[PDB]
Amino acid sequence: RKEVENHYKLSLPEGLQLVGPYDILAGKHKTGLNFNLHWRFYYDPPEFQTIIIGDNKTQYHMGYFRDSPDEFPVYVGINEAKKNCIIVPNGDNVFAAVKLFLTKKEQRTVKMKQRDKKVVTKTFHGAGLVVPVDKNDVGYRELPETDADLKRICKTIVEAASDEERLKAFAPIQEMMTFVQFANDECDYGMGLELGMDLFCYGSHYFHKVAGQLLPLAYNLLKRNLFAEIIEEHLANRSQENIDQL
């Protein structure tokens, strides 16, 4: 086990194809190889570590989801990367995940119910953000914009017919970034976590640097540097073909 988890730099708990760490378990890893990119799809956030690929038409996939690089997976998540950005839970163990797929062709446990009790906002992926919370709640503040209007902002930015129109539509995002840095000044990092995650989720390249200005920094602020590494190299390589042996 130990060399596998040294290779992925993460702790792993004890017609489909098993991938990710299973590649090493299959010995398929024996061919410069950055396992921080190993099986990371176009829409896989650093919290989500993909372990199974399925239908390539919809890019349906299953993965370990760790909220922080020093913690265990909090669930197995699923997403159809060619279809949408929604991450749907897929059980608390590999047994639960495979039976969910098998029945589909516990998903949310009591500890996961505690995580949902810790879910402060769903942030376009529906899984929620977790921030450590003191008695004065510093660490998070809510965004001044709702989810639908944020989706509207991303919509009007991406459909602008020119770069000047795009940057002009970027102005509420710029002010939202200003308030995010305000929150950073008062240590309310979960706000920038929400904004940067949404910019990641939209998938247009126009948000890569600004989220890359915020979300690694925030993960730097969150002391989650492995995720910062993942997001930098991922923004450099968020691909539609994601096998590390290519």
Binding site: V138, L167, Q181, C187, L217
Partner: protein, 470 residues
């Protein structure tokens, strides 16, 4: 303020005027809300008489506050007495009050509430005043806080309505300080939302439950008051002005001097600029385009020069509001405004890292020109603060300023001097303050209470330089 005709009477906005008679002007706006059973409604009434023809009318308009609604035009063919009676009847119907004593208004429960409404110069100084005193940009800012950020649904409000807002927020502060989630809290929020207009769409108006949400309300309400004073300041002037921004500068009445790059002051402040750009504000750098000398009358004798611990501290603020400040200086949290919203108590807030306060400038990629102020503040004996506490004012016991202790800050060994002030030159470094009880602030901050303990001395013209976008 001045009384315009609401444009919604398009067939009569141009041929008719709202009727007035001294004190009693037959125009009134009512708001009602009841989150318990989901009432959220407005009602404007305006009595309009034509300029050309002798005919009086009442215009009424209704809907959700924020969402423009159904209107009615009731003409009377010049029978103003019946029309005024109708006006008064509709008023009592909605208010249970007589109309004529609108000044002595007392809202009654389960009825609508009223509300109350409203060229020889350097080119660089011209750019600065045009930046701060342009009536167009202030108009655009107000429009942004109504239809871009739906913060002022009906429109504007009065200074006294702002004070009532502060008063109601104080009551809310008292309420939340008791943490009970029953009826009185809901009615107090109703009192708030009636005095302070919101737009919530379909969902029930949420309970304002944390101090952070209160603080957002605080920023909103102060921003509104700032709008009022900003629009009041930009009032035009006669007697041969030939360039209205110069009378705006007279309204500022503050000596402001341009500085050369070759001065020692410019070099050391640019050094200070570069040294104190926080690295976690790495979406931009900051360039010194200009530095302006500030001389606000009367502060010299009033400044607490007697107090030690004199340092030069930043204060950043939006592109627009400086016009108030340059006329009037910085102010502490209003007495009516609750003290508990401000994480280190009330007073005037200053930073020792240029970029943190510089975040409050709201600069943009298209609009790359921003201002930073430096102020000399004689802190005296500082109270050292680990964690946010609005009760900072009581812990002084004779003291004159508080320092909120951040993890990162420049070190006293690296400090320089300017004009007898100790200049805390950067870069930021570890401060070794830790908290085994709560968290530790990222960066130091300084809080003062007496406004006379501050002497604004230079204004920094700061080009906020952002970078690549994808």
């Amino acid at each position: 303020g001045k009384a315009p005709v609401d444009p919604e009477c398009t067939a009569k906005v141009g041929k008719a005027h709202v009727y007035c008679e001294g004190n009693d002007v037959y125009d009134v706006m009512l708001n009602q809300t009841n989150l318990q059973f989901n009432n959220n409604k407005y009602y404007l009434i305006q009595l309009l008489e034509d300029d050309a023809q002798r005919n009086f009318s009442v215009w009424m308009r209704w809907g959700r506050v924020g969402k423009m609604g159904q209107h009615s035009l009731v003409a009377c063919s010049g029978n103003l007495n019946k029309a005024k009676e109708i006006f008064q009847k509709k008023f009592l119907d909605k208010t249970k009050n007589n109309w004529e004593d609108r000044e002595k208004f007392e809202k009654v429960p389960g009825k609508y509430d009223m509300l109350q409404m409203d060229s020889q110069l350097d080119l660089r100084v011209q750019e600065l005043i045009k930046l701060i005193c342009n009536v167009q940009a202030m108009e655009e800012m107000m429009m942004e806080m109504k239809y871009n950020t739906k913060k002022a649904p009906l429109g504007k409000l009065t200074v006294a309505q702002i004070k009532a807002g502060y008063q109601s927020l104080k009551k809310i502060e008292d309420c939340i300080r008791a943490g009970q989630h029953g009826r009185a809290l809901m009615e107090a929020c109703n009192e708030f939302y009636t005095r302070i207009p919101h737009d919530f769409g379909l969902r029930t108006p949420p309970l304002i439950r944390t101090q952070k949400e209160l603080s957002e309300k605080i920023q909103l309400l102060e921003a509104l008051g700032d709008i009022e004073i900003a629009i009041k300041l930009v009032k035009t002037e006669l007697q041969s002005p030939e360039h209205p921004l110069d009378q705006h500068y007279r309204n500022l009445h503050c000596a402001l001097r341009p500085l050369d790059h070759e001065s020692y002051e410019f070099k050391v402040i640019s050094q200070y600029l570069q040294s104190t750009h926080a690295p976690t504000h790495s979406d931009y750098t900051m360039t010194l385009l200009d530095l302006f000398e500030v001389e606000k009358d009367g502060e010299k004798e009033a400044f607490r020069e007697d107090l030690h611990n004199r340092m030069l501290l930043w204060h950043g603020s939006r592109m627009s509001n400086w016009v108030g400040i340059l006329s009037h200086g910085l102010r502490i949290a209003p007495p009516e405004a609750p003290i508990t919203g401000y994480m280190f108590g009330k007073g005037i807030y200053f930073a020792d890292m240029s970029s943190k306060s510089a975040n409050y400038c709201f600069a943009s990629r298209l609009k790359n020109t921003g201002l930073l102020l430096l102020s000399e503040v004689a802190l005296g004996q500082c109270n050292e603060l680990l964690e946010a506490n609005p009760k900072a004012e009581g812990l002084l016991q004779g003291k004159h300023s508080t320092k909120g202790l951040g993890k990162m800050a420049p070190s006293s060994a690296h400090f320089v001097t300017l004009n007898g002030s100790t200049v805390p030159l950067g870069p930021a470094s570890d401060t070794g303050i830790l908290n085994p009880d709560g968290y530790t602030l990222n960066y130091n901050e300084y809080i003062v209470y007496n406004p006379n303990q501050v002497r604004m001395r230079y204004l920094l013209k700061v080009q906020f330089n952002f970078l690549q976008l994808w």
